[PDB]
Design a protein around this ligand. Structure first.
Ligand SMILES: CCN1C(=O)c2cccc3c(S(=O)(=O)N4CCC[C@@H](O)C4)ccc1c23
Length: 127
């Protein structure tokens, strides 16, 4: 059993910006999801050795989690809000790919995804 390297959270050659929408994705969107009762399985990269999921990284090839997103946001990693939203979408999609409808973890992702969409339905205006 071997975990892969987790996704990067810094990259000096990547272009980045500090926009009002990205600030909101950290202060409001991420920090609200983070406190939800169903958030904890999503707060760090899947540790497939700890969790005894040896097929996880056989199936999931673009891993993503809210801990990585949080550090990317805190480290000014993104150029725009769409990039960050894409990471959220990847996290949710990975969960549906690796699992099945009805699994507890899937019920958890579905709840978070609906909350996520509710929060990004309206974003602040790129001042
Ligand atoms: C979101 C990333 N991710 C998966 O894709 C996934 C698949 C099966 C279990 C599991 C666990 S768990 O064992 O801690 N637990 C979580 C709560 C519900 C339980 O059924 C299982 C934590 C995080 C996970 C998984």
């Amino acid at each position: 059993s071997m975990n892969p390297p987790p996704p990067e959270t810094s990259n000096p050659n990547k272009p980045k910006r500090q926009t009002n929408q990205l600030q909101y994705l950290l202060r409001v969107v991420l920090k609200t999801l983070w406190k939800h009762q169903f958030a904890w399985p999503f707060q760090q990269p899947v540790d497939a050795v700890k969790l005894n999921l040896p097929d996880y990284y056989k199936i999931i090839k673009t891993p993503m989690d809210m801990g990585t997103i949080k550090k990317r946001l805190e480290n000014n990693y993104y150029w725009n809000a769409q990039e960050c939203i894409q990471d959220f979408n990847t996290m949710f999609t990975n969960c549906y790919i690796y699992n099945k409808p009805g699994d507890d973890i899937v019920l958890m992702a579905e709840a978070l995804e609906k909350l996520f969409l509710q929060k990004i339905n309206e974003l602040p205006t790129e001042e």
